[PDB]
Amino acid sequence: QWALEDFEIGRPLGKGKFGNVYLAREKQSKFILALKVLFKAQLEKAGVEHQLRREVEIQSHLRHPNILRLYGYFHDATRVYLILEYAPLGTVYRELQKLSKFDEQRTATYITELANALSYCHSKRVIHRDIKPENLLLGSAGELKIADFGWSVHAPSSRRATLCGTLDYLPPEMIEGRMHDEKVDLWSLGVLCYEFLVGKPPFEANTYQETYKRISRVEFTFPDFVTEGARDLISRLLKHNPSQRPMLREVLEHPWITANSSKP
Ligand SMILES: Nc1ncnc2c1ncn2[C@@H]1O[C@H](COP(=O)(O)OP(=O)(O)OP(=O)(O)O)[C@@H](O)[C@H]1O
Ligand SMILES: O=C(O)c1cc(-c2cccc(Br)c2)nc2ccccc12
Ligand SMILES: [Mg+2]
Structure with a gap:
């Protein structure tokens, strides 16, 4: 449903173990979001490809205001991207x-x-x-x-x-x-x-x-x-x-x- 070519990437918002999180905008709608990029190599070496999959399954089916929304995901040949709600106060x-x-x-x-x-x-x-x-x-x-x-x-x-x-x-x-x-x-x-x-x-x-x-x-x-x-x-x-x-x-x-x- 999604590919990278639909988003304008921006400033890095943060970093954790497996790849950076980036400010980004959906070109058509102008939606601001956060893009969580993970490198496949590193998820293979560390044995945590399942963690990411559950991250996505559990989180997508969760609707509460004190929980961050996951709107979806897509993947490249070398990277996995999660489309997240963006928290502007860090x-x-x-x-x-x-x-x-x-x-x-x-x-x-x-x-x-x-x-x-x-x-x-x-x-x-x-x-x-x-x-x-x-x-x-x-x-x-x-x-x-x-x-x-x-x-x-x-x-x-x-x-x-x-x-x-x-x-x-x-x-x-x-x-x-x-x-x-x-x-x-x-x-x-x-x-x-x-x-x-x-x-x-x-x-x-x-x-x-x-x-x-x-x-x-x-x-x-x-x-x-x-x-x-x-x-x-x-x-x-x-x-x-x-x-x-x-x-x-x-x-x-x-x-x-x-x-x-x-x-x-
Ligand atoms: N939606 C967001 N809005 C603003 N900043 C964010 C957002 N998501 C992540 N960040 C920044 O990116 C950093 C790392 O993100 P996150 O904890 O999701 O990745 P991770 O720890 O590497 O993931 P995991 O522990 O599941 O493997 C956060 O600590 C935060 O500083
Ligand atoms: O090579 C793949 O096809 C691959 C795909 C994915 C993947 C694909 C779609 C959604 C999610 Br979450 C993860 N994660 C990986 C995680 C580690 C290594 C490979 C992969
Ligand atoms: Mg973290």
Whole structure:
């Protein structure tokens, strides 16, 4: 249905592991979008051609405002292109670099948006598994938008791919290879909530190795400026036992969320 010759390419919007993402416009309609280009060679070598295929299948069938739209795809002899909705305010990663840390209002708001989009996903039994500030995009109204469904799967699940990124967001059961379900996303939600208020994820280290330890032991400590209500929500999400983590309603109605989150 599509080829490259229908789009005017522009500035690179960003980069991740397998190829750049580019601002682009559809010549006929004048639609602005983001084009995610992946090189086939690299997807063959790293053994992740399936991840990309699911990325496309899961994501195309998802309609919620706090989730990035995939409108389609096409491929060349050497490259795969995904036609994405374009997030003009960039990433939550960049915002965190500018501002160092977020206030409780911004945090509780982002968390709210997150939980909602996760509620939606978990209602179709879909787990994201890669909730990272680099994949949380900001739309024109400043609203959060989950991107990157490369790692997303149908729950429950086991890991059949060597996660070779930072483990900062991953809970114990997923690094330990052990099975897992939608509870994985609630652990990630607490790491984010920590990182937003503190700036840095709560198990950061100069090695993957120590990061593993700290995760499996659940060793985090809060700076003095984190308030009781924030501490309670974070402590409630970062439990080793996935069964003991709350439901997404319990997040949404948590006192600290309701008092700081700015709903529509
Ligand atoms: N729709 C978009 N709007 C603006 N910027 C984007 C958009 N999509 C991606 N980017 C930029 O491109 C970067 C990498 O994109 P993305 O996470 O989709 O690719 P990836 O991590 O390499 O994919 P995957 O983890 O599925 O293999 C993002 O972190 C962001 O900075
Ligand atoms: O050579 C191919 O035909 C090929 C095709 C695709 C492909 C084609 C259409 C949609 C998607 Br998602 C992926 N992915 C690859 C990923 C890795 C290597 C090759 C491929
Ligand atoms: Mg990414």
